Amino acid sequence: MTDTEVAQITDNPYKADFPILAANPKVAYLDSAATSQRPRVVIEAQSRFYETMNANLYRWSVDATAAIEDARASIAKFIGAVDNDKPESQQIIFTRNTSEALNLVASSLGRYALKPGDDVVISIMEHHSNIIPWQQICKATGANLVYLRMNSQYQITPEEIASKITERAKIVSVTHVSNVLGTRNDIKAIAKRTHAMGAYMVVDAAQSAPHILVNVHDLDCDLLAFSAHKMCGPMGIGVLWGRAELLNAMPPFLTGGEMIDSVTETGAVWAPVPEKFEAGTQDAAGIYATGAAIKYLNGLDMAKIEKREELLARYLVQQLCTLDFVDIVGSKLGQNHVGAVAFNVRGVHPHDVSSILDMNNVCIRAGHHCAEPLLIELHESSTCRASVAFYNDKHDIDQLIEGLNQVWKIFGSAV
Amino acid sequence: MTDTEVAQITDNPYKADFPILAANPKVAYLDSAATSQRPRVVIEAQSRFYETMNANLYRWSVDATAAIEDARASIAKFIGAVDNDKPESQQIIFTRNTSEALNLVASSLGRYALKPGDDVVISIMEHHSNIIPWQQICKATGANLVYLRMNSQYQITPEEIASKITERAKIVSVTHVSNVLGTRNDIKAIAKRTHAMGAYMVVDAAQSAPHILVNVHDLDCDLLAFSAHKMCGPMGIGVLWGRAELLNAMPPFLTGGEMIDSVTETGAVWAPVPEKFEAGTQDAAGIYATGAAIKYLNGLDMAKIEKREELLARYLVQQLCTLDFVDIVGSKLGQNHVGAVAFNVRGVHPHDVSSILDMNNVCIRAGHHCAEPLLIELHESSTCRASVAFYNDKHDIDQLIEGLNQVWKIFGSAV
Ligand SMILES: *Cc1c(COP(=O)(O)O)cnc(C)c1O
Numbered sequence A, B: 001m002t003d004t005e006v007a008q009i010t011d012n013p014y015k016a017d018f019p020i021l022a023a024n025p026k027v028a029y030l031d032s033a034a035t036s037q038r039p040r041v042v043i044e045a046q047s048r049f050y051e052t053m054n055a056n057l058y059r060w061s062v063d064a065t066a067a068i069e070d071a072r073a074s075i076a077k078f079i080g081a082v083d084n085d086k087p088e089s090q091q092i093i094f095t096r097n098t099s100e101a102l103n104l105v106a107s108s109l110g111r112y113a114l115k116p117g118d119d120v121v122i123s124i125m126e127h128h129s130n131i132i133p134w135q136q137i138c139k140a141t142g143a144n145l146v147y148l149r150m151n152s153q154y155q156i157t158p159e160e161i162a163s164k165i166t167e168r169a170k171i172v173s174v175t176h177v178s179n180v181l182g183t184r185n186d187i188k189a190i191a192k193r194t195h196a197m198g199a200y201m202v203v204d205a206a207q208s209a210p211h212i213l214v215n216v217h218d219l220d221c222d223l224l225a226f227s228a229h230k231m232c233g234p235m236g237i238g239v240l241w242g243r244a245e246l247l248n249a250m251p252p253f254l255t256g257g258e259m260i261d262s263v264t265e266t267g268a269v270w271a272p273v274p275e276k277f278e279a280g281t282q283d284a285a286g287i288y289a290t291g292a293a294i295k296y297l298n299g300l301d302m303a304k305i306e307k308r309e310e311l312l313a314r315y316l317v318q319q320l321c322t323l324d325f326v327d328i329v330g331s332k333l334g335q336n337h338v339g340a341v342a343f344n345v346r347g348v349h350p351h352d353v354s355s356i357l358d359m360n361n362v363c364i365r366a367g368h369h370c371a372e373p374l375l376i377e378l379h380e381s382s383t384c385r386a387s388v389a390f391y392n393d394k395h396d397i398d399q400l401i402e403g404l405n406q407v408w409k410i411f412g413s414a415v
């Protein structure tokens, strides 16, 4: 890392936008892979909605309706879902989180497409929300759950892709970026083999949408999901994008108010996409604030965010490599980590590491990070995990490193 | 209505707590049956969460965890779910809205309990979200959907309850209060016959929780759902309560992160209730603000809210009865309406009524109100609907009445 790069991450042009960080200047929040901190404008956008256009033909209702549509368009443009050049706003579906979006896909796409003997292929890197819905629908449909495995560099090889995704595959669902390893998978290449085999491509983008360019048209996926709260938006909002023809073909998930066109005692006619997939009163204020988060990120420029986060990831990994008592659970190259770096202090339980780090005002995660099959594959029962965002800086990372030296002094070999 | 009662509703001790009402003094918001307006403290409680304890072992995470638990307890106490005297906080499950809670119940309780030939009994008054999930699970399980019908006073009689809920019944799901008629159904009496017949009792309390005392122990229901946004809370938060033994018996609905205890490549062990039913990152800030709404309502005293809303409902119905060109779709007695009064201007489409009312700064709903089978039963294709909350006053209702006289001048018989 050059002097110029180190100077760039020593500077912090962004943290002042986050009230909780300004109010807590001592805290090094290194757990953005669990959830983002909130820009002031996103917090206020939610309150403004409630103060000025709160409603579910009168003006406040017209106003709330237009706010939802404008946020859908912003979200679509953010992920490259554009025609014309018009945003594909009607291919944007709201959920509570990525987890609900993946349950929706597994139920709806699974019922639509899976026959007994079909394969559903996922990776060993998947978060639990891109695992258990597939366990469940596979049992219900007679399909088989297949796993893509990793090589010694924590990657999925082209050879593994061709070996595991064969003619029996019907759905393939893979994380764009692992929330533990930080590995960025070659989703476009996986999609190519998936489609050759007559299968649909599902992408868990919860860890990519905050960090790297997501373009659904370039990725060639059929469905893609992420969570607003991991990209500076509010909690309570997840996004599902899908190809228009496929969403039309897929059956509804939740049923009830607002997702119908008409109802009788015995049956119902469904509304068009995306209302077909949105049952009952939606979180209009959260949707509105998700649009505000998108506008906020666009204003900072995602290319500048990515450049800064790349430098922070490189610095984090570099500094962890100077501690010989630290085992990095993942690649030892910082450029191979998008956002997340998992690690252990050798001989010390992550609960104890995190406790000492918290006493030093450093926030990390300890445990299996909702990727237990991955940790089992890696012969770990738990790890620490530090993660970086553009509102972090070099000093946050140095604080972590100083904390880990304190851990080693308290629990290390000398004791 | 006595002079004292009229004076009570002419006074408005509550509207100043609602920023959108203070900022829009001309507007008569008579659509609280669709969603509440937000007290200032509830809007600010959500922002405060994000500003001060935003996280998903470090302090902000401990703090967010304790906030969720404290809101669960407040909610449990609000609906009478108390031991000891301890709130049954672990029987409180969060969803996005009543609609998702009812889909959860229909899927989970339906898979658990329904055999082919069983009856599911609902009422003709149900909102679509307490209809279509039952259509769906009945088809999947071989059960039959049965409807409780009304008499000429818009009530369900004891004779109808005994006639339709027989030994084949396995699940009965009924609205506590109709969102169209304002009829309060005798849920406790329905529950008694339901249980005699070996069936489970489900209650849609979305229109009762904002207005009348809800005590799950006195109602004798097995499951009960409502929406925070209809009782001065934020959007995005629904509540499901269930008997502890039954929630334990019921299978999970959504699966994935946070609702497990452990996961392998092929299977999973579920977490205890209520985490078993909460998949992925929850809307902690919305949960927190829902607790704030409960505290706000408790501070006003629900008994005083109910007394005031009873007087407003009586006045609304009384004044509508003075307009001979208005047909009330429901009881002509104001005391038979909890919150909602549906009506039509004879010979005028509700879209036109609502449009003129909006030009007069009156907000009502027009259409089928997500209860189309009810309107079909009543030989209506659409109605108007005005609804009252404690932050309304006599002047709001007089504004509606003046607006309806304008409608009659523009579209009535003379034209
Ligand atoms: C955290 C995460 C999820 C789950 O997101 P929720 O918002 O909690 O539903 C899914 N996949 C990945 C890769 C994640 O990092």
Ligand SMILES: *Cc1c(COP(=O)(O)O)cnc(C)c1O
Binding pocket: A257, A279, A280, A281, A282, B033, B034, B097, B098, B099, B100, B127, B129, B130, B175, B177, B178, B179, B204, B205, B206, B207, B227
């Ligand atoms: C509005 C309402 C519902 C639906 O509530 P959501 O919050 O939109 O899911 C269900 N039942 C009744 C009686 C309602 O009034």
